[PDB]
A and B are shown apart, each in its own frame.
Chain A
Amino acid sequence: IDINDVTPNCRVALRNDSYTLHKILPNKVDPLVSLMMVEKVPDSTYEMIGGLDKQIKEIKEVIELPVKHPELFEALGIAQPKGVLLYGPPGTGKTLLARAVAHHTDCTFIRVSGSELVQKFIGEGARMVRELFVMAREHAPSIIFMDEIDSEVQRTMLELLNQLDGFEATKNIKVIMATNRIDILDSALLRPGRIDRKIEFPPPNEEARLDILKIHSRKMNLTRGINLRKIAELMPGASG
Chain B
Amino acid sequence: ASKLPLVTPHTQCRLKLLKLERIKDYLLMEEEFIRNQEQMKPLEEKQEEERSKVDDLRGTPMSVGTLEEIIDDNHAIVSTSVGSEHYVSILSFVDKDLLEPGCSVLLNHKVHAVIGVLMDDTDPLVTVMKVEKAPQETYADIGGLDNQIQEIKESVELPLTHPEYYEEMGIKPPKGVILYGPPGTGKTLLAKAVANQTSATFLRVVGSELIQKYLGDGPKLVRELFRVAEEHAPSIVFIDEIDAIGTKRYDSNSGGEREIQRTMLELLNQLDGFDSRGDVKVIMATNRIETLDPALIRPGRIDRKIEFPLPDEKTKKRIFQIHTSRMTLADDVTLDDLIMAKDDLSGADIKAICTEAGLMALRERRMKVTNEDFKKSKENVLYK
Does A193 contact B352, Cβ atoms closer than 8 Å? Answer: yes
State the Cβ distance, A100 to closest chain B Cβ, in Å. Answer: 21
Does A78 contact B208, Cβ atoms closer than 8 Å? Answer: no
What are the interface flags for B130-163 relative to A under an 8 Å C-beta threshold, 1 for contact and 0 otherwise?
A: 0111011000000000000000000000000000
Residues of A contacting B124 in the complex (Cβ-Cβ under 8 angstroms): 124
Closest to A129 in B: B209
Q: Is A158 an interface residue (CB 8 A)?
A: yes
Residues of A contacting B132 in the complex (Cβ-Cβ under 8 angstroms): 169
Residues of B contacting A131 in the complex (Cβ-Cβ under 8 angstroms): 128
With A18-B60, A152-B250, A193-B352 as known contacts, state yes or no: A77 contacts B136, CB within 8 Å: no
Q: Is B327 an interface residue (CB 8 A)?
A: yes
Does A166 contact B135, Cβ atoms closer than 8 Å? Answer: yes
With A128-B125, A192-B348 as known contacts, state yes or no: A167 contacts B131, CB within 8 Å: yes
**Number of residues on chain B facing chain A (CB within 8 A):** 46
With A128-B125, A167-B131, A193-B348 as known contacts, state yes or no: A155 contacts B355, CB within 8 Å: no
Q: Is A4 an interface residue (CB 8 A)?
A: no
Does B61 contact A76, Cβ atoms closer than 8 Å? Answer: no
Q: Is B27 an interface residue (CB 8 A)?
A: no
Q: Is A81 an interface residue (CB 8 A)?
A: yes
Q: How far is the CA of A128 from the CA of B382 in the complex (A)?
A: 36
Q: Is B363 an interface residue (CB 8 A)?
A: yes
Q: How far is the CA of A81 from the CA of B217 in the complex (A)?
A: 36
What are the interface flags for A1-23 relative to B under an 8 Å C-beta threshold, 1 for contact and 0 otherwise?
A: 00000000000000000111000
Q: How far is the CA of A127 from the CA of B129 in the complex (A)?
A: 13
Does B252 contact A152, Cβ atoms closer than 8 Å? Answer: yes
Does B183 contact A191, Cβ atoms closer than 8 Å? Answer: yes
Q: How far is the CA of A204 from the CA of B324 in the complex (A)?
A: 41
Q: Is A39 an interface residue (CB 8 A)?
A: no
- A76: which of B129, B325, B328 is its contact (CB, 8 Å)? B328
Residues of B contacting A37 in the complex (Cβ-Cβ under 8 angstroms): none
Q: How far is the CA of A201 from the CA of B308 in the complex (A)?
A: 39
With A134-B128, A192-B349 as known contacts, state yes or no: A78 contacts B359, CB within 8 Å: yes
Q: Is B175 an interface residue (CB 8 A)?
A: no
Q: Is A79 an interface residue (CB 8 A)?
A: yes
Closest to A133 in B: B128
Closest to A192 in B: B352
Q: Is B367 an interface residue (CB 8 A)?
A: yes
- A167: which of B183, B204, B349, B381 is its contact (CB, 8 Å)? B204
What are the interface flags for B205-224 relative to A under an 8 Å C-beta threshold, 1 for contact and 0 otherwise?
A: 01011001000010001000
Does B206 contact A159, Cβ atoms closer than 8 Å? Answer: yes
What are the interface flags for A73-86 relative to B under an 8 Å C-beta threshold, 1 for contact and 0 otherwise?
A: 10111110100000
> Using a CB-CB cutoff of 8 Å, which residues 184-209 of chain A contact chain B?
188, 191-193, 198
Q: Is B242 an interface residue (CB 8 A)?
A: no
State the Cβ distance, A134 to closest chain B Cβ, in Å. Answer: 7
> Using a CB-CB cutoff of 8 Å, which residues 318-347 of chain B contact chain A?
325-328
Residues of B contacting A75 in the complex (Cβ-Cβ under 8 angstroms): 367
Does A78 contact B348, Cβ atoms closer than 8 Å? Answer: no
Q: Is A162 an interface residue (CB 8 A)?
A: yes
Q: How far is the CA of A73 from the CA of B358 in the complex (A)?
A: 9
With A127-B217, A127-B221, A166-B136 as known contacts, state yes or no: A191 contacts B250, CB within 8 Å: no
Q: Is A229 an interface residue (CB 8 A)?
A: no
Does A134 contact B127, Cβ atoms closer than 8 Å? Answer: yes
State the Cβ distance, B33 to closest chain A Cβ, in Å. Answer: 41
Does A76 contact B60, Cβ atoms closer than 8 Å? Answer: no
Residues of B contacting A19 in the complex (Cβ-Cβ under 8 angstroms): 60-61
Q: Which residues of A contact B (CB under 8 A)?
A: 18-20, 61-62, 72-73, 75-79, 81, 124, 127-131, 134, 151-152, 155, 158-159, 162, 165-167, 169, 188, 191-193, 198
Known: A76-B362, A191-B348. 8 other contacts (CB 8 A): A20-B60, A73-B362, A127-B125, A127-B212, A128-B129, A159-B206, A159-B208, A166-B136
Q: 7 closest Cβ contacts across the A-B interface? A: A78-B358, A77-B326, A193-B348, A192-B352, A19-B61, A78-B355, A169-B133
CB pairs A–B below 8 angstroms (13 shown): A75-B367, A76-B328, A76-B361, A76-B367, A77-B326, A78-B362, A127-B125, A130-B128, A155-B248, A162-B240, A167-B135, A191-B184, A192-B349
